[PDB]
């Protein structure tokens, strides 16, 4: 539920 902590976090960060 968050395209900024998933499409940018786990996707880029994690």
UniProtKB/Swiss-Prot annotation:
InterPro entries assigned to the protein according to its UniProt record, in alphabetical order:
Mastoparan
Origin superkingdom:
Eukaryota
Any one of the GO BP annotations: killing of cells of another organism
Q: Which family does it belong to?
A: Belongs to the MCD family. Mastoparan subfamily.
Per its record, what are the GO molecular function terms? toxin activity
The organism named in the record is: Vespa xanthoptera
| Keywords per UniProt | Amidation, Antibiotic, Antimicrobial, Fungicide, G-protein coupled receptor impairing toxin, Immunity, Innate immunity, Mast cell degranulation, Membrane, Secreted, Target cell membrane, Target membrane, Toxin
Annotated localization: Secreted; Target cell membrane
> Where does the record place the modification Leucine amide?
14
Its signal peptide is none
- What does the entry state regarding organ or tissue expression? Expressed by the venom gland.
In Swiss-Prot or TrEMBL terms, this protein is called Mastoparan-X
Q: Which GO terms describe its cellular component?
A: extracellular region; membrane; other organism cell membrane
What the protein does comes down to: Antimicrobial peptide with moderate activity on Gram-positive (S.mutans, and S.aureus), and Gram-negative bacteria (S.enterica), as well as on fungi (C.albicans, C.glabrata, and C.neoformans). Also acts as a mast cell degranulating peptide. Its mast cell degranulation activity may be related to the activation of G-protein coupled receptors in mast cells as well as interaction with other proteins located in cell endosomal membranes in the mast cells. Activates G proteins that couple to phospholipase C. Does not cause hemolysis to human erythrocytes.
Q: Does the keyword ATP-binding apply?
A: no
């Amino acid at each position: 539920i968050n395209w900024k902590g998933i499409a940018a976090m786990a996707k880029k960060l994690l």
